[PDB]
Design a protein around this ligand. Structure first.
Ligand SMILES: *[C@@H]1O[C@H](CO)[C@@H](O[C@@H]2O[C@H](CO)[C@@H](O[C@@H]3O[C@H](CO)[C@@H](O)[C@H](O)[C@H]3NC(C)=O)[C@H](O)[C@H]2NC(C)=O)[C@H](O)[C@H]1NC(C)=O
Ligand SMILES: CC(C)CCC[C@@H](C)[C@H]1CC[C@H]2[C@@H]3[C@H](O)C=C4C[C@@H](O)CC[C@]4(C)[C@H]3CC[C@]12C
Ligand SMILES: [Ca+2]
Ligand code: NA
Ligand code: NA
Ligand SMILES: [Zn+2]
Ligand SMILES: [Zn+2]
Ligand SMILES: [Zn+2]
Ligand SMILES: [Zn+2]
Ligand SMILES: [Zn+2]
Ligand SMILES: [Zn+2]
Ligand SMILES: [Zn+2]
Ligand SMILES: [Zn+2]
Ligand SMILES: [Zn+2]
Length: 785
């Protein structure tokens, strides 16, 4: 029928006549009078001194009559031009200790101001370009940058912000994606994205609605001007108590559109950055007009950054594969390949991997089986994530064939910037600013991941978060109140402490070789808790302590401390192939050397390095069968270099380091610790499981003037999850000296301590002088280099 009076309605029971909401233009339909009653534009969007005190001319976009403040439909500059007040940006920011909200407000509202493609570096253009945004940053809580999820695209990141899930869990693994169960494709442009079958998890607007918290319509048809969106949000905030939503969302497609066109370093970028700042100012002027500028929590958040890319820098699969017409490629700043699924696609995953592996000297992309991607990306577990993946170098593109490159008729590309690269790339980092009563005042917080924001916004709204992948409590330092109180998880499996129980006479099944007060110097942060049911033993030695699993026949963790001045010894010739039985552990619960001799592809290594033994007598402990783990010979090149060369180097740089190393089983690549039933590989003819990865947590003192074992204040951690591979094809320069490639491989596979905890069932840093919230921040820190 008619949209009279009910423009941008939030009807839940049932709109009477037609459709009049924000998303009626794009999807479904609208009434006929929508564009006049609801999309008024007369006089523009700012008040003139000529029209101050006007008579309510309803046809106007916004009103400058004195009755506008009652209905909340004034122009955002009405108080400034018609009542002599100042702009919000011209006021000195005053510390907001408590929310200054109207009488009926039950919780301080949350407005999410999302900007598409706002590079974190844009914040340095200063107040001459973005005075409003600079006031939000300098007076609220801001990080230097926020880390998006991989892929660093719009839809995966905006939905990750709304759900707190990795894209592999909430389902929006890309702007483009194919679902084999649906047998359909999903795209930014289309009506398919409106179908609810694509969206997993529980987004914030659903979490709020299910718990009684009203949410305004987060989305807007593209034909709704930004000034009308701001005016609509301010009109909703003037609704009565029983109808007023508590959470709102404003999304701007800029500066993404200009960043794509002119690049991130173009002088033209100051024009859209000014228009965004004016939209922010219109919102803050409108909130000050409603006296809500010291009541509402405002989150100025971006989805991803922006990198200089050009048509010039494009890699083509036709330069690597013989036939590219039998595969489908999701191209651009990333690569996802799948079979055309025709009758005879004739397609082999690792054959295509092999054809893409280290073929050109300056190759600007690397192929991966999705299971072998760096575990920090968490982009391996979804039916919509193809098995083959390409990590594209920053500043570069990957395409199927050269004809796919679209350029202007002139000798110039259509785009100068793009986005979607690895989320540790500095140009992909985006902006986070929190401004309001619940956020801290003039506070700078360390960079963090956007998966953590859903928990925070649930805390800001009094909502119990749906199960997600943020670490609840790791961002408490952002808020001045309403924090979540994290609890250290209960230990599930309690260790045995075995003494000398066996005679060594019923031992050495194929092997040959020619307590608690001195090991505390190696277990600085308490023993890790085993959060799953298992049987395991604590083993003490002069140089290291270990939690040996009687089930997996190997330690779950091995802890030891190396000092700045520790000297590296070699492995003696008479001890190179020495393995000694451990009289504390039953022979039936120990590994045996017969299995390694029979397994022609599996060697063995040691979790504690014999290279760092404190004395010749102590070195015999490092060769115990309980310190031994299965290791491919190709992996031993990485492990031996790390143990012999890098541990000493790190200890000399960081004034000593404490190292915790152990195995990882993830055969179903869900990022979670495997049970026995899921382990799919053992050492030949034995029950010794093979780890898919090996982790190490290298902790030292943040204050490098104090040694690692005498550290007072905060800790400095760098962890990694190295893939246990029978080859080093991931490292193109592995033929050269290990000093050229081993550390580059380890930096690529950096990881959160939290990532290691998901994959092991262990819980670290349980005995520290720091608060648990501070430790949760430590566990969620990524050394990106
Ligand atoms: C990111 O968060 C996700 C939760 O939002 C985690 O995914 C969850 O993993 C759980 C592992 O047990 C699944 O539990 C299953 O729940 C169903 C309920 O009907 C039951 O089968 C079982 O309780 C359980 N299944 C098994 C085999 O134990 C959750 O279903 C699952 N959640 C979703 C939404 O899929 C991710 O693991 C987590 N990612 C990381 C890296 O930690
Ligand atoms: C590009 C513009 C036209 C805007 C497009 C908006 C579009 C992506 C939005 C509009 C409606 C959204 C769905 C709706 O809010 C409800 C749900 C249920 C919830 O449990 C999961 C998310 C889902 C399906 C929303 C997905 C995003 C939609 C389609
Ligand atoms: Ca698993
Ligand atoms: Na062998
Ligand atoms: Na190689
Ligand atoms: Zn119009
Ligand atoms: Zn300038
Ligand atoms: Zn975007
Ligand atoms: Zn973009
Ligand atoms: Zn094979
Ligand atoms: Zn892929
Ligand atoms: Zn015998
Ligand atoms: Zn495991
Ligand atoms: Zn990794």
């Amino acid at each position: 029928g008619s949209c009279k009076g009910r423009c941008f309605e939030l009807q839940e029971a049932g709109p009477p006549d037609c459709r009049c909401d924000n998303l009626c233009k794009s999807y479904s339909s609208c009434c006929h009078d929508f564009d006049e009653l609801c999309l008024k534009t007369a006089r523009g969007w700012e008040c003139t001194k000529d029209r101050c005190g006007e008579v309510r001319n309803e046809e106007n976009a916004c009103h400058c009559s004195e009755d506008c403040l009652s209905r909340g439909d004034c122009c955002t500059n009405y108080q400034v031009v018609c009542k002599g007040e100042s702009h919000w940006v011209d006021d000195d920011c005053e510390e907001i200790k408590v929310p200054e909200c109207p009488a009926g407000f039950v919780r301080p509202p949350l407005i999410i101001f999302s900007v598409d493609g706002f590079r974190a570096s844009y914040m340095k253009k200063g107040s001459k370009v973005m005075p409003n945004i600079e006031k939000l940053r300098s007076c609220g809580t801001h990080a230097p940058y926020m880390r998006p999820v991989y892929p660093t695209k719009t839809f995966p990141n905006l939905y990750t912000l709304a759900t707190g899930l990795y894209p592999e869990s909430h389902g929006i693994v890309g702007n483009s994606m194919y679902d084999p169960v649906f047998d359909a494709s999903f795209h930014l442009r289309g009506r398919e994205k409106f179908n609810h079958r694509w969206w997993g998890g529980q987004p914030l607007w659903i979490t709020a609605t299910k718990q009684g918290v009203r949410a305004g319509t987060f989305f807007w048809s593209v034909s709704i001007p930004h000034e009308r969106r701001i005016l609509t949000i301010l009109q909703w905030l003037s609704l009565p108590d029983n109808e007023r939503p508590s959470v709102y969302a404003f999304y701007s497609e800029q500066p993404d559109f200009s960043g794509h066109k002119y690049g991130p370093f173009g002088p033209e970028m100051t024009n859209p950055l000014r228009e965004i700042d004016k939209t922010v100012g219109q919102l803050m002027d409108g909130l000050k007009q409603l006296r809500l500028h010291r009541c509402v929590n405002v989150i100025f958040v971006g989805d991803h950054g922006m990198e200089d890319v050009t048509c010039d820098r494009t890699e083509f699969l036709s330069n690597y594969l013989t036939n590219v017409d039998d595969i489908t490629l999701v191209p651009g700043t990333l690569g996802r390949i799948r079979a055309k699924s025709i009758n005879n696609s004739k397609y082999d995953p690792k054959t295509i991997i092999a054809a893409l592996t280290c073929k050109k000297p300056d190759q600007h992309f690397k192929p991966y089986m999705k299971q072998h991607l760096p575990k920090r990306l968490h982009y391996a577990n979804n039916r919509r994530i193809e098995d083959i993946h390409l990590l594209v170098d920053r500043r570069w593109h990957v395409a199927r064939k050269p004809l796919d490159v679209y350029k202007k008729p002139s000798g110039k590309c259509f785009f100068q910037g793009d986005h979607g690269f690895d989320n540790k790339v500095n140009s992909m980092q985006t902006v986070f600013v929190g401004y309001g009563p619940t956020f801290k005042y003039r506070t700078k917080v360390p960079p963090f991941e956007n998966i953590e924001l859903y928990n925070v916004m649930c805390d800001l709204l009094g909502l119990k978060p749906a199960p997600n992948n943020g670490t609840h409590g790791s961002l408490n330092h952002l808020l001045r109140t309403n924090t979540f109180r994290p609890t250290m998880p209960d230990e599930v499996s309690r260790p045995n402490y075995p003494g000398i129980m066996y005679l060594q006479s019923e031992f050495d099944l194929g092997c040959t070789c020619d307590k608690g007060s001195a090991k505390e110097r190696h277990l600085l942060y308490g023993r890790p808790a085993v959060l799953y049911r298992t049987s395991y033993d604590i083993l003490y030695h002069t140089d290291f302590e270990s939690g040996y699993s009687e089930i997996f026949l190997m330690p779950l963790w091995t802890s030891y401390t190396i000092s700045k001045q520790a000297e590296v010894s070699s492995i003696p010739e008479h001890l190179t192939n020495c393995v000694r039985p451990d009289v504390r552990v039953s022979p039936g619960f120990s590994q045996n050397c017969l299995a390694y001799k029979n397994d022609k592809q599996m060697s063995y290594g040691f979790l504690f390095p014999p290279y760092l033994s404190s004395s010749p007598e102590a070195k015999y402990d490092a060769f115990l069968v309980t310190n031994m783990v299965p290791m491919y010979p190709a992996f031993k090149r990485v492990w031996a270099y790390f143990q012999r060369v890098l541990v000493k180097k790190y200890a000399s740089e960081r004034n000593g380091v404490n190292v915790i190393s152990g195995p990882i089983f993830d055969y179903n690549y869900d990022g979670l610790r495997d049970t026995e039933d899921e382990i799919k590989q053992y050492v030949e003819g034995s029950s010794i499981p093979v780890p898919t990865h090996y982790y190490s947590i290298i902790t030292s003192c943040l204050d490098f003037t104090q040694p690692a074992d005498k550290c007072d204040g905060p800790l400095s951690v760098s962890s990694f999850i190295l893939p246990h591979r029978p080859d080093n094809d991931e490292s193109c320069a592995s033929s050269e000296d290990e000093s050229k490639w081993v550390e580059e491989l380890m930096k690529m596979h950096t990881a959160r301590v939290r990532d290691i905890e998901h994959l092991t069932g262990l819980d670290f840093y349980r005995k520290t002088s720091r608060s648990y919230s501070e430790i949760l921040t430590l566990k969620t820190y990524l050394h990106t280099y």
